Amino acid sequence: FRFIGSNNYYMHYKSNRMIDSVLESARDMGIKVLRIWGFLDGESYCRDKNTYMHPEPGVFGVPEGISNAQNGFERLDYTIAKAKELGIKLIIVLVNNWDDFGGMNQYVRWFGGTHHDDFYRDERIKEEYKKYVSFLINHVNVYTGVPYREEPTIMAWELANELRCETDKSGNTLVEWVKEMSSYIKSLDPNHLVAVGDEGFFSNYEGFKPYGGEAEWAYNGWSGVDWKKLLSIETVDFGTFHLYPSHWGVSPENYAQWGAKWIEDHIKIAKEIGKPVVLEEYGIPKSAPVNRTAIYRLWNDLVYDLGGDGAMFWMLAGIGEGSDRDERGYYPDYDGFRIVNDDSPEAELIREYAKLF
Numbered sequence: 432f433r434f435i436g437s438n439n440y441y442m443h444y445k446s447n448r449m450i451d452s453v454l455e456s457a458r459d460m461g462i463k464v465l466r467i468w469g470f471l472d473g474e475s476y477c478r479d480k481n482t483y484m485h486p487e488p489g490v491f492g493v494p495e496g497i498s499n500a501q502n503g504f505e506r507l508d509y510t511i512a513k514a515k516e517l518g519i520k521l522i523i524v525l526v527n528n529w530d531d532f533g534g535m536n537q538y539v540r541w542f543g544g545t546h547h548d549d550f551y552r553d554e555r556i557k558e559e560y561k562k563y564v565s566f567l568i569n570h571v572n573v574y575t576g577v578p579y580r581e582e583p584t585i586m587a588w589e590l591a592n593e594l595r596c597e598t599d600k601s602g603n604t605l606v607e608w609v610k611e612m613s614s615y616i617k618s619l620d621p622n623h624l625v626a627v628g629d630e631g632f633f634s635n636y637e638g639f640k641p642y643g644g645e646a647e648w649a650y651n652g653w654s655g656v657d658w659k660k661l662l663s664i665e666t667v668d669f670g671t672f673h674l675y676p677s678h679w680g681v682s683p684e685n686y687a688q689w690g691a692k693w694i695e696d697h698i699k700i701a702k703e704i705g706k707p708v709v710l711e712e713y714g715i716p717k718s719a720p721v722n723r724t725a726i727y728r729l730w731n732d733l734v735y736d737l738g739g740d741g742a743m744f745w746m747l748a749g750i751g752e753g754s755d756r757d758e759r760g761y762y763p764d765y766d767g768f769r770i771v772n773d774d775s776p777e778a779e780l781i782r783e784y785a786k787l788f
């Protein structure tokens with residue numbers, strides 16, 4: 432299984448029309464796998480979307496006495512059921528490193544901690560994360576009758592989107608957390624693949640330096656991520672990496688080659704370890720002073736020619752509604768990375784590559 436994939440983060444709280452637009456666009460484009468969020472942590476974040484998944488510790492779904500609210504499990508159920516009809520496979524991420532939709536800092540606020548990375552260390556927080564993931568993985572989909580544990584439309588669980596641990600640059604805290612959590616998920620669900628969902632950073636590996644000497648922090652362990660050590664964990668099935676040179680300090684004239692070397696390095700390491708590897712987010716800002724389509728072509732050619740298992744752009748959106756609707760009626764391009772199923776050269780490129788992978 433090799434594929435072109437994408438991401439969409441609003442599949443657990445937008446309307447049926449909007450969810451069907453994303454998944455129909457994926458099918459029409461040849462996009463075989465969509466990576467989505469399976470979290471909405473904290474009462475403020477749930478209230479902002481009037482959709483509830485984990486508003487407080489031990490509360491899963493809508494709090495007793497709250498009426499006229501959406502249940503994010505029901506919306507996830509509808510997305511799964513539609514993806515199953517349309518032949519799209521889903522990778523579902525279980526918590527966010529970042530504060531969007533609550534993230535790890537929401538868990539740290541619940542348990543009265545004092546730094547984001549207490550999420551990995553406080554046993555009361557780890558227990559709450561396991562209680563949440565057990566509730567989700569055991570959840571019976573209301574549109575299918577099939578618990579997520581048994582649902583083949585789900586391709587993989589991911590532990591945490593873009594997890595970082597800057598307080599432990601040895602990389603050990605994340606290794607121990609990923610071992611514990613990936614083994615815990617395998618104990619709940621022996622059927623599905625497990626991946627971390629990290630960006631792929633290295634931690635000073637002999638012979639691996641960045642292109643051009645830029646974004647050295649992605650190679651020298653600054654974020655507390657040792658990708659090679661994480662991929663070596665027995666209960667992690669495939670490696671994940673992300674690629675945003677414009678966020679990371681690379682110059683625009685080096686975006687293409689920095690990305691190219693990033694992809695080559697990750698494929699080399701995963702091939703030696705002997706597990707599959709997925710470039711599961713990449714993006715160049717629409718306003719960058721370079722040809723975005725040609726960078727995306729180069730990167731997808733490299734993943735394809737070097738034997739990587741998938742390439743997934745951030746991000747695919749569909750029709751919009753309400754306050755999230757742009758000048759053409761789509762969900763807006765808020766971050767400069769949105770692709771939709773239109774006549775843009777990016778959209779045409781994805782269609783072309785989805786025929787080859």
Ligand SMILES: OC[C@H]1O[C@H](O[C@H]2[C@H](O)[C@@H](O)[C@@H](O)O[C@@H]2CO)[C@H](O)[C@@H](O)[C@@H]1O
Nearest residue numbers: 446447448450451452509512513516574
């Ligand atoms: O009453 C049958 C059916 O109607 C609605 O289903 C939509 C579905 O959501 C769309 O994706 C598309 O398939 O057209 C259908 C209606 O013809 C409801 O969502 C559903 O609960 C219900 O079973």
Ligand SMILES: OC[C@H]1O[C@H](O[C@H]2[C@H](O)[C@@H](O)[C@@H](O)O[C@@H]2CO)[C@H](O)[C@@H](O)[C@@H]1O
Nearest residue numbers: 529530531593630673674675678679712
């Ligand atoms: O593309 C991921 C990107 O994320 C970071 O930005 C965070 C932001 O810092 C947080 O405040 C949060 O609320 O939302 C954003 C989620 O992306 C990083 O700055 C960057 O290195 C990383 O690529």
